[PDB]
């Protein structure tokens, strides 16, 4: 499981209550309770800023809130301070075992204003088809921060199977740059009505479509 | 007090084995057995992969032997498997509920063989000229290693502008996928015989090609 469910990214303004969450698949919470909130920074030491839902260790300042609302579990950061930007963890036991961790959400200081991912899709080239395999490929651009979602429906269905994303890079405009991929071969490719690529940022999520011809 | 010590690169060629130390302080680790390591795959989150000293969880790979000495946790990877390159640390109980964690310990497996790159270029299309851009994206995927040059021509002579590469993301198997995007308009993309897209890989290039042949 990762099953903890955390929003791409999290950019804020020097003085911003950045809130975060986490949300989980199949079941633990309800049983379970007791979770824990990381930071991760930059190649630096990944600590435990929150234990058990809102107990903060010693040495953490209070800023760092954390609570639960059911499922969802939350952090939130009141007064973004510069040097708070990082990659903030999340995760829960099960039993006799059982870490799992959120997704991960990587926090922004702004630099630059908020951008959106434009995405586009690319079908599978008819010389493509010509060769015996087949790729999709979505492409993300001209986004900050570079934290960014990338699921693929095959007819809505999610497909977790073929997919292949890519950690984003910056452009030389200054923004940033992302695409994730998927490889068939031409069957299933042709014996489904559609394929879809879903991107998710700053409260907004895209989602675009694609489906076969056969002109060639 | 500090963060528990690991060495910050290493070393498993492939079959070969692995051991990695986590020293600490009769504090944090001895006294306590209570020091975990967790499987860090470049920021996707960290599989917990031991936290009971040597308890494994079942769903993570027998061959990562963990076991405590002196004041100082140990990882064997045995056997070594190419997929094992990641980023790993361990954690020591103290004891206010509060945790610290290790230096990091990036393995490099060695011997992986050299993957040259599937350049699965394509056009623009259908809905793209529909809006009216003109996206053209070179999927270079999967290569070992990561050092790969894209150069794009413009119709015979090349094309410096308007364009971006996106440089080695780590794949889901050792190899990396690097993009590549040229961005233009319908009545750019028209006036050429062609477009291409040239990756050099090691002392190797392919150039592929794109006539505005428009199947879609
Ligand atoms: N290191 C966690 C312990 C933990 C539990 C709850 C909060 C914080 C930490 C286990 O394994
Ligand atoms: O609390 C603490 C240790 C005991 C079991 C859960 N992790």
Redesign the interface.
């Given at each position: 499981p990762?099953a903890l469910t955390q929003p791409p990214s999290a950019s804020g303004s020097l003085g911003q209550s950045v809130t975060i969450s986490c949300t989980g698949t199949s079941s633990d919470v309800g049983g379970y309770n007791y979770v824990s909130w990381y930071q991760?920074h930059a190649?630096k030491?990944?600590?435990?800023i929150i234990?058990?839902v809102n107990?903060r260790?010693?040495g953490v300042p209070d800023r760092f809130s954390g609570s639960k609302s059911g499922n969802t579990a939350s952090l939130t950061v009141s007064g973004l301070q510069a040097e708070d930007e990082a990659?903030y963890?999340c995760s829960s036991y099960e039993g006799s075992?059982?870490?799992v961790?959120?997704?991960?959400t990587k926090v922004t200081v702004l630099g630059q204003p908020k951008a959106n991912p434009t995405v586009?899709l690319?079908?599978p080239?008819?010389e493509?088809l010509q060769a015996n395999?087949a790729?999709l490929?979505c492409?993300i651009?001209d986004f900050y921060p570079g934290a960014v979602t990338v699921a693929w429906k095959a007819d809505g269905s999610p497909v977790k199977a073929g997919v292949?994303?890519?950690?984003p890079?910056k452009?030389?405009n200054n923004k940033y740059?992302?695409?994730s991929?998927l490889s068939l071969t031409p069957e299933q490719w042709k014996s489904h009505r559609s394929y879809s690529c879903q991107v998710t940022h700053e409260g907004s999520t895209v989602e675009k479509t694609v489906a076969p011809?056969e002109?060639?």
């Open positions: 990762s991760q190649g030491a990944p600590k435990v234990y058990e107990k260790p010693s990659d963890y075992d059982n870490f961790f959120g997704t991960g586009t690319f079908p080239s008819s493509e395999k790729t490929v492409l651009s292949e994303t890519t950690k890079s452009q030389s740059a992302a695409s991929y011809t002109c060639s």
